[PDB]
């Protein structure tokens, strides 16, 4: 077993600490990479940062992760440090890539591009979770506000960049114009799936190993479905 109670406790609180990362700076990835393709960059260009179209996508899509991630951690560790565990990942994930890359590579106004706020929701989730630690309950309520909160949440970072000027007999939003200035291009390809359903998968997926025991507990996909509030968190568009 473990030797002295000062190692047995050591090579624990350390493997445990060093452990916590493995999860985060790894799930994060598999998450962002997703939230990207899913939330077609309504979390990218302020000019795509609108009212209907937007806080209707990120809201939903922004969960089959922030969700299982929760059901995950909270489950086997009744550690209400999950729903939020996810988020940060995306934020510190994008927020990173946002700077240096877009900014230090083909410099883009940290204004035109910049992720959407989520930290808030996560909380009003990981919490309506903590208290009342049952599924359904955390699903209905929780998922609900999780979306209503969205926009209202982002008001700060967003609000201001919507004042308007008159550019040549026409009207636009600080936003809009920021999009007019500093230009780019299209989408613009696709195939983007070999690398995914290949090796990166069953060459990492198998674990398993032949026997069950798993993170297929993501039967949280459910969690997401009950979102139908996020589709509500829409009609907060006059």
Partner 1 sequence: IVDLRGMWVGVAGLNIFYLIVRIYEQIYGWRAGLDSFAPEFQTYWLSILWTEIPLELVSGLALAGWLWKTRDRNVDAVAPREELRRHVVLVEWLVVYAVAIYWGASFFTEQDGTWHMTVIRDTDFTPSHIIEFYMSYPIYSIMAVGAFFYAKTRIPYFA
Partner 2 sequence: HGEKSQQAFLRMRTLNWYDVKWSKTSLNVNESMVLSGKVHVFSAWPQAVANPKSSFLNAGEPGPVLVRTAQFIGEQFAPRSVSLEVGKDYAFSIDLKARRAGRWHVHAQINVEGGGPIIGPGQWIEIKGDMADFKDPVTLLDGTTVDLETYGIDRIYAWHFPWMIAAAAWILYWFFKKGIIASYLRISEGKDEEQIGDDDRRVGAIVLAVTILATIIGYAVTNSTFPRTIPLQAGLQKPLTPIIVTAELKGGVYKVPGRELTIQVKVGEYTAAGLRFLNPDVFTTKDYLLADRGLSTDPTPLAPGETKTIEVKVQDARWDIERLSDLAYDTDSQIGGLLMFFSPSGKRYATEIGGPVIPKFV
Handedness of CA 126, 128, 133, 138 (dihedral sign): negative
Secondary structure of residue 14 in the 3-state scheme: coil
Interaction between residue 75 and a copy of itself (CB under 8 A): no
Angstrom distance (rounded) from CA 114 to CA 48:
11
Binding-site partner at residue 159 among partner 2, a copy of itself, partner 1, none, CB < 5 to 8 Å by type: partner 2
Secondary element (H or E) of residue 75:
helix 68-77
Interaction between residue 131 and partner 1 (CB under 8 A): no
Angstrom distance (rounded) from CA 62 to CA 39:
8
Task: Name which position in 76, 105, 170, 171 contacts partner 1 (CB under 8 A).
Answer: 105
Binding-site partner at residue 207 among a copy of itself, partner 1, partner 2, none, CB < 5 to 8 Å by type: partner 1
Q: How many residues of this chain bind partner 1 (CB under 8 A)? A: 53
Residues 192-221 that bind a copy of itself (CB under 8 A): 193-194, 196-199, 202-203, 206
Cβ within 8 Å of residue 184, ≥6 positions away: none
Region from 57-65, 66-74, 125-133, 222-230 binding a copy of itself, contact rule CB under 8 A: 222-230
Residues 163-192 that bind partner 2 (CB under 8 A): 163-178, 180-186, 188
Secondary structure of residue 108 in the 3-state scheme: coil
């Amino acid at each position: 077993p473990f030797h002295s109670v000062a190692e047995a406790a050591g090579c624990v609180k350390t493997t445990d600490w060093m452990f916590l990362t493995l999860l985060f700076l790894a799930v994060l990835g598999g998450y962002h990479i997703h939230f990207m393709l899913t939330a077609g960059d309504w979390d990218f260009w302020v000019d795509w940062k609108d009212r209907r179209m937007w806080p209707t996508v990120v809201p939903i899509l922004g969960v089959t992760f922030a969700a299982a991630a929760q059901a995950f951690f909270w489950e086997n560790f009744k550690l209400p440090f999950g729903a939020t565990f996810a988020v940060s990942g995306l934020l510190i994930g994008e927020w990173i890539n946002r700077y240096c890359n877009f900014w230090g590579w083909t410099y883009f106004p940290i204004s035109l591009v910049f992720p959407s706020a989520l930290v808030v929701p996560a909380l009003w989730l990981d919490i309506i979770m903590l208290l009342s630690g049952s599924y359904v309950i955390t699903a209905v309520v929780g998922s609900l506000g999780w979306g209503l909160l969205f926009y209202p949440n982002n008001w700060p970072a967003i609000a201001a960049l919507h004042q308007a000027t008159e550019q040549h007999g026409q009207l636009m939003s600080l936003a809009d114009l920021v999009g007019f200035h500093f230009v780019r291009t299209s989408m613009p390809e696709y195939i983007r799936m070999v690398e995914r359903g290949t090796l990166r998968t069953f060459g990492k997926e198998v674990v398993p190993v032949a026997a069950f025991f798993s993170g297929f507990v993501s039967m949280m996909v459910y969690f997401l479905w009950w979102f139908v509030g996020k589709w509500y968190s829409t009609t907060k568009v006059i």
